[PDB]
Amino acid sequence: DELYRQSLEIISRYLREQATGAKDGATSRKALETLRRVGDGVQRNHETAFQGMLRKLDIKNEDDVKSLSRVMIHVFSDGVTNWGRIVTLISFGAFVAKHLKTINQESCIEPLAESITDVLVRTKRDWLVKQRGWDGFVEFFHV
């Protein structure tokens, strides 16, 4: 599954660098750049709401992603799919990834990243392909 692999790589690298706080094909790099610009912006603009959501969710640990999965599934339960919701999901994923680091230094952000990727790729695979995948993602948020 190439789409899954690419998605997991992109999403993982963003969450990891957001969590640790530092940065270490072409499409993947452009997507990560777009994700950095839009995703950081979403986190800054909606920190209060994100904080509240996080507090209410009360995530204990890195492996505690089941509630998050239910939330991502429910987001699309109205039958609406768009890039805006997708990037906001990933943004919140990074916000959560940071907090886990607050709770402990050594958390693997992988379970969180894979949790997000599974919902996107499994449930919206044909939507993603129709939208031109991550190339479509980059184009949509272009400035």
Partner: peptide, 23 residues
């Protein structure tokens, strides 16, 4: 419920962003 509330927030912020970039 926290999950539903989270979903609605993400749905609201997502749609805001989508409308914004939709040109």
């Amino acid at each position: 419920r926290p999950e539903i509330w989270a979903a609605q927030e993400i749905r609201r912020i997502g749609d805001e962003n989508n409308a914004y970039y939709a040109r």
